[PDB]
């Protein structure tokens, strides 16, 4: 739920363009046509779940890896769009001069299964990361060029409320154990013929017993009962839960549905800090990464771009 | 699911929270008829 | 218990010789339910050929008597003797004597049985989950 | 300072929440069972598929000597620690609990 | 796991309002009664139709 | 159903809670009209 | 290992005592120290420690 | 116990002369059971050898008896002798005797149990966690 | 009954949020080799400005 | 403990000096493990001393006797003497005898011993955070 | 800052309520990086 949820709030709406001569018909088709709006949520969750990961544009009749713009090119030739995780790519250079567009981001791209190389250029990629690194020249471990999982804050909250679920869910089976001493027990035990007529009789003289049936016992067998205690452990699994929902960033009337263990939604600020999240990642992390894209497909419309067209 | 390597939290043999748990199917021809007809709650 | 321990008291305990039938047929065959397959091997041999030797102890010897007949039924105590004029005094045991109950059975009196008490506890933990 | 006070704390209580109620059983002779390899196995082997099971639906069978005991903590006024803590931290970082912790 | 966390805590908690409350009786020399069937019987018919 | 190997959690023998339960039918001639003319509850 | 799931051994003579602490009212204790911290800043607690 | 702790005792208990088939056959293979590899090195020779010393004293020597067959099943304490007149009194041993109880075996009667006691309690902690 | 977060203006109003994010991500893409072919079995004319 | 303290109790212990066999090989092996290089420096050797011979002493004399062989396996204590007329009487150890117990070793006995318990008090606190 | 003569209400020997108490600096470096890193209150 913490890697899905705030991503998929992300494109469930999006993107009303502005200028009608007919042509904001047709500049939807081709983003329905290459299925946009469900590529970019596949591509954001593996980027949530894993470093990192890059959706790559296809232009018809384009080479390689060159300093790749696909924004001159004025036609109606758009065909490729594959999402792929940090998994399937590599970003096997860094590139530290301080000049250069796309400055600490890897220059190349060994990308493909099988047949080829295929270097690949970052300006025909789309790149996308759960968390940005502090200092992404110090970075170890697999993603080098990527950004950081968003399991790896919220690890410590996380498995905190997951083991006192399973702890308090145990104790209920344990609600009352009833023990039986019996005087010389050591002795009864101590063949199997002996205590098989001992454990027969007992299973069906305690099978029965409650509020029908009352037990006979001799005056030297004891039948103690210990009773576990139960006492606030209700409001110890709700405050792990918080602190699950503020590690995800998602207030309790999103996160665990609409819980009855929410008393600070007043009935006009529900949940406005929770759009207020969202639409920055729609205008810091989907805006400025699409801008290969999104000049390119306003472009594949039949070649003519004009200057005061946005969304 | 889980599994701590001591104090048995997820083994099967141990802990009986739900690590000991599964389903098994059940039917009912005649006794249908017997709920229906003298229990409020089936009816 | 695929072998019952016959015939080897004699020999392991060296007092008793004197009958073979009131020890084999007589005790042996009310012991050995006690012994399970369920104890070790260094076990199942002297445990029974122990608790054996305290029921004939508990009577007098082997068929209750030596060669005086000289048994008494209740096994009272000897507190002081003295033979410079003939005098006795004895012990009281009627439900219960020197602590030793009286709705057990009391294994802990002699040697033959004290040496079974320390090899029934070690191969008999005791628990039930019934 | 204000966020190590915070998560010591939950580190805690979270580990209590394992020993809710620890329970014991006193053998009477444990110093002489446990002094062989052999020995204890055979009883600590049964007291595995004795104490098991035991609940509700199954019960323990004992000897009169022994004792079974058991020790229940308390979880008594934990849960407003818990919340006194996150203040103190929402506060250095000048964030209400309407934007830090989400809508708590 | 959620799923079989609530399903058995419902059927440990329904299974002691069974024994909401279960009392014993201890007899002095209860060990001889129950020694055979003639005898056992004439106990335990009688303590039915006192507990009933 | 459930039914745990351990702690017999659905045992019909051990377990009493659902496990041994059933319905018999009823029937009622004579006690219907008892039970309208002198119970507020059945009226 | 000891807790839910494993029951410790021990034996007649060793004791096991367990000394639970108080937490009793040290919370209310808690918050009337901060207010006399923001009286003396003479900044309310809707600023001084955020929306409380 | 790679080594059987056999025919030491003679050494290294000097009283212990009589026989050597009642003792090693006959106790030594009761005994060393209780020892482990578990335990220390120095420990695995002298406890065996001392608990089995226990096993011999408890009974009268080695093989039950010295050249005097006088050897009595309860080990009843003697406490007050006299031999001007000859007088005896006797203890009282029924379930327990002096600070000894009934259901457990007691180490603490002799010497070579004692030296037993004190190396059994070094060398086994007592704590299970099952 | 233990519901005491339904405000009576935004009772379900993230349930219905959710649908919403089915019906426009698992049932809308994947129906695009129908609902271009249904719309053409109108007697084989398929308009552009046709839509839902 | 870089050094055992072998035959050195015939200086420092002078009633001890009838063999030096039963003295450093028998009981200087068995009792060097409570001695430890944690201890102080003027401790490691007169405690090991000390608590030797406790163990000779609680037998008879080093080789468990002196030239009269006439010890018992159960150190009993006399209570009364006379030789007038030959007459003893004896003291009841059975389990414990005396505010003596009977599942520890009892070290307040002889003096060769208490000087090791307050020793061993000293040096050895008794705390633990496992 | 108080001070009782009886009672030793602001010795700093005797009392320890804030008598006894100062601060230190503090620095870090490295666990800068792991503490943004691996704690959701510090990012």
């Known amino acids: 739920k913490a890697v899905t949820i705030p991503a998929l709030d992300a494109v469930r709406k999006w993107r009303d363009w502005q200028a009608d001569q007919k042509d904001i018909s047709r500049i939807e088709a081709t983003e329905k046509r290459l299925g946009l709006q469900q590529k970019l949520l596949q591509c954001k969750t593996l980027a949530r779940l894993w470093g990192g990961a890059a959706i790559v544009i296809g232009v018809k009749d384009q080479d390689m890896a060159t300093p790749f713009e696909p924004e001159t090119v004025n036609k109606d030739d758009l065909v490729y769009l594959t999402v792929m995780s940090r998994r399937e ?64 804050a919220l690890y410590d909250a996380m498995m905190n409320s997951d083991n006192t679920q399973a702890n308090i869910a145990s104790l209920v089976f344990e609600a009352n154990v009833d023990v039986i001493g019996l005087p010389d027990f050591m002795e009864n035990m101590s063949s199997e013929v002996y205590r098989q007529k001992l454990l027969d009789r007992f299973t069906l003289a305690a099978a029965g017993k409650g509020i029908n049936k009352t037990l006979m016992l001799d005056a030297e067998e004891v039948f103690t009962a210990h009773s576990r205690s139960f006492a606030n452990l209700d409001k110890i699994m709700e405050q792990f839960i918080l602190f699950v929902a503020g590690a995800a ?63 | 699911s889980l599994r701590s390597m001591i104090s048995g939290l997820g083994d099967p043999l ?26 409020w709650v089936a009816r | 218990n695929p072998i019952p321990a016959a015939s080897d008291l004699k020999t392991r305990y060296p007092e008793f010789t004197g009958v073979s039938d009131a020890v084999v047929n007589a005790i042996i065959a009310e012991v050995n339910g006690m012994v399970d397959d369920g104890w070790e091997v260094s076990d199942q041999k002297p445990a029974v050929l122990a608790l054996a030797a305290h029921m004939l102890s508990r009577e007098g010897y082997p068929g209750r008597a030596t060669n005086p007949n000289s048994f008494d039924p209740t096994n009272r105590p000897i507190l002081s003797r003295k033979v410079g004029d003939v005098s006795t005094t004895f012990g009281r045991t009627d439900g219960g004597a020197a602590e030793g109950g009286a709705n057990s059975y009391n294994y802990s009196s002699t040697v033959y049985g004290q040496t079974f008490l320390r090899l029934l506890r070690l191969n008999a933990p005791a628990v039930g989950l019934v």
Not at chain 1, 260 to 279: C, E, F, L, V
Not at chain 2, 23 to 38: F, G, I, S, T, V
Request: proline share 7%.
């Open chain 1, 249 to 311: 960033d998602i207030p309790l009337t999103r996160f665990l549905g609409q819980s009855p263990a929410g008393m600070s939604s007043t009935g006009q600020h529900d949940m406005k800090n929770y759009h207020d999240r969202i639409q920055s990642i729609q205008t810091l992390d989907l805006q400025p990464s699409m801008y290969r894209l999104d000049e390119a497909i306003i472009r594949s419309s039949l070649g003519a771009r004009p200057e005061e067209l946005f969304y």
């Open chain 2, 14 to 39: 141990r802990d009986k929270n739900a690590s000991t748990f599964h389903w098994d199917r059940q039917l009912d021809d005649r006794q249908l008829l017997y709920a229906y007809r003298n229990s």
């Open chain 1, 89 to 152: 790519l590599s970003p096997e250079e860094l590139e530290q001069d301080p000049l250069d567009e796309f400055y600490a981001r890897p220059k190349r791209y060994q990308v493909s299964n099988g047949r080829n190389l295929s270097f690949v250029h970052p300006s025909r990629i789309v790149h996308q990361v759960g968390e940005t690194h502090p200092d992404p020249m110090l970075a170890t471990g697999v993603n080098v060029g990527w950004g950081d999982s968003t399991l790896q």
